[PDB]
């Protein structure tokens, strides 16, 4: 005989019925990097801890009027 029932039962007791696979469709020829988590910085310290001030304020921009004839 084949004893297909009983060799299924053999396979059951010896492996424990965890015996199939979830086959995944995979269609792309190329596999790519999964898109994952990307934080932004939370520094324990600032880089320089003091903002530099307005470099380019107006009183510093405008140096001079010209006083020439043209």
């Amino acid at each position: 005989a084949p004893s297909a029932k009983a060799t299924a039962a053999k396979k059951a007791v010896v492996k424990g019925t965890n015996g199939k696979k979830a086959l995944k469709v995979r269609t792309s020829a190329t596999f790519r990097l999964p898109k994952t988590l990307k934080l932004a910085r939370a520094p324990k310290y600032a880089s320089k801890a003091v903002p530099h001030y307005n470099r380019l304020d107006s009183y510093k921009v405008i140096e001079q009027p010209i006083t020439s004839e043209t």
């Binding site: 005989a1 004893s3 029932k5 009983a6 039962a9 053999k10 007791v13 010896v14």
Partner: protein, 55 residues
């Protein structure tokens, strides 16, 4: 053992007086191969804390 086969016959060993198990028995399922694979599978099988021996 109906998992392994529709049995030809089973018999169990009890005492005849105050009938309780003397811990053995016999079977035929149908086939020689069925008996072989059952024995091969369960020769040294453990359970609650007896273990069966089958031949």
């Amino acid at each position: 053992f109906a998992q392994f086969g529709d049995l030809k016959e089973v018999r169990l060993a009890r005492n005849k007086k105050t009938g309780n198990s003397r811990h053995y028995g016999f079977l035929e399922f149908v086939n020689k191969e069925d008996a072989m694979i059952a024995q091969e599978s369960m020769n040294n099988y453990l359970l609650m804390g007896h273990l069966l021996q089958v031949r």
